[PDB]
Amino acid sequence: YQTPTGIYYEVRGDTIYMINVTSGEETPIHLFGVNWFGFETPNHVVHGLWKRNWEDMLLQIKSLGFNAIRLPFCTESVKPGTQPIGIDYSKNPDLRGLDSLQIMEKIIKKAGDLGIFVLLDYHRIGCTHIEPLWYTEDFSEEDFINTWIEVAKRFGKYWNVIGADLKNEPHSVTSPPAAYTDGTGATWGMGNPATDWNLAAERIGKAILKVAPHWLIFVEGTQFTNPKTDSSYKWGYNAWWGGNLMAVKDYPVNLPKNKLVYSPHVYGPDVYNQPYFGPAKGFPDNLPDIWYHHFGYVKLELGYSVVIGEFGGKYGHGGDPRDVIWQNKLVDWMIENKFCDFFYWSWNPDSGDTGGILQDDWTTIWEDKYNNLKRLMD
């Protein structure tokens, strides 16, 4: 167990372990997580620091029973010198004069004092859009990897950083079948290095494990994988961005079994009006089998650690009424099948189709939404 902190994380079966290498103590951990976003935006800092103090926010997250944060970032936020925008330095006087990296470091050190796990998520290459692929004509794979290497060297020193969510939401920007071969979108198992996320995750993960051997590597799904795989299931074309893990069975990512975590995204009627959200398609009793095929079998049949990295919705608040039913159904199903490690989207209220756990006052929570979610925390 090599580690620069004394702590080494690893997967055993479908369970995540935290190992203290000096003393030999080791425990399984849950991830009861939330996303707290903003470092992937042009403000270059988690949102909500106009109305709240950053440390009060971490304390509140903890008081609600969460023990983990997924922290989205974009390339510019993790380069030295990038200035954060929108902080009220009267509520946050200890942030005055800090750059976004210093703020990230301060927040992660504090989460660690509070016993909060951090998962780092390279959410966008620019700070405006999630790209479909892990590069761009102006930012190469080599650049993407070098950024993760400099993130891993800097943040690998914080004991509570559990690892790297390689690239948020690989997806497509045209329909199949062109999306499989037109080079504009992520694929999986096409046998084409320009677009295959399964092969990229191997290359990117290996590079990170060289400098942070103690980290977990979280790999999301794609949107479309390969014609064979997607056409083999009736809703095979209707998986979310980062939400199609159908190609794992035939094309497993070839990263060490004790390091690899699979991390699908899954959403409800508030995010997209999927055909399968018709009561006249089986809703909501049809859901379990759809989740099972899109990603659940990766745990339930193949035995891997599967940590849902995003799910959420308005839960009836200025949104689709079916959302309340959908989050209730999805949480029942995660309980019944022991998907106990997750990250909810999001802590922040300022997410247009999902809202968050906090209300728009950035202070009060959606009680009912939270009470449903809290069933996962036992």
Ligand SMILES: [Zn+2]
């Ligand atoms: Zn768990």
Ligand SMILES: [Zn+2]
């Ligand atoms: Zn437990």
Ligand SMILES: [Zn+2]
């Ligand atoms: Zn900027």
Ligand SMILES: [Zn+2]
């Ligand atoms: Zn800029």
Ligand SMILES: [Zn+2]
């Ligand atoms: Zn762009």
Ligand SMILES: [Zn+2]
């Ligand atoms: Zn089935």
Ligand SMILES: [Zn+2]
């Ligand atoms: Zn998302």
Ligand SMILES: [Zn+2]
């Ligand atoms: Zn309500």
